[PDB]
Design a protein around this ligand. Structure first.
Ligand code: HEM
Length: 154
């Protein structure tokens, strides 16, 4: 699929606000995921034991994981669809080391969209959420295609 430059601009505009606090947004996103979809927590051998939202908030390991996720994702969006080199190593570790089903990527997408909506109401109106949703659906699509070539899912 293809995003127009205007949709890309919508996406990189909100993203620039995210980047004012990568660590905070990363915590919010992971916690939102793990609360909504507890089964995802189990994939994280280093976080698996955390029982409550308060423990999550206090974990320096979870905060570090969030920055990683967002830092990686940010590098992809900034490519505006020309993200083939970037997707390859991510698709390989997520399919063959971590074994992350596509379904779980949909879940974190929903969590990203939830947090932007709460923290940036002004820069995340309907048009901007439609564009981020498209950007994330592109990402998921391309990653699903890579999984299949690598021998996972599909
Ligand atoms: C926006 C989507 C995501 C991005 C950009 C992302 C990116 C990354 C990055 C850059 C790493 C470190 C290097 C590597 O192993 O590839 C990583 C590690 C990891 N990711 Fe993801 N990830 C995403 C989604 C997920 C989801 C949804 C899960 C599980 C439900 C997950 C589970 C893991 C695990 C288990 C590791 C290893 C953590 C540790 O033990 O160091 N990832 N991810």
């Amino acid at each position: 699929m293809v995003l127009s430059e205007g949709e890309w601009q919508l996406v990189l505009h909100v993203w620039a606000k995210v980047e004012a606090d990568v660590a905070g947004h990363g915590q919010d996103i992971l916690i939102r995921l793990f609360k909504s979809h507890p089964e995802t927590l189990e994939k994280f051998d280093r976080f698996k034991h955390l029982k409550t939202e308060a423990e999550m908030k206090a974990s320096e390991d979870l905060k570090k994981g969030g920055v990683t996720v967002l830092t990686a994702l940010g590098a992809i969006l900034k490519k505006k669809g020309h993200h083939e080199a970037e997707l390859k190593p991510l698709a390989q570790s997520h399919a063959t080391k971590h074994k992350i089903p596509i379904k779980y990527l949909e879940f974190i997408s929903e969590a990203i969209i939830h947090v932007l909506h709460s923290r940036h109401p002004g820069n995340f109106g309907a048009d901007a959420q439609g564009a981020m949703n498209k950007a994330l659906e592109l990402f998921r699509k391309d990653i699903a295609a890579k999984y299949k070539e690598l021998g996972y899912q599909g």
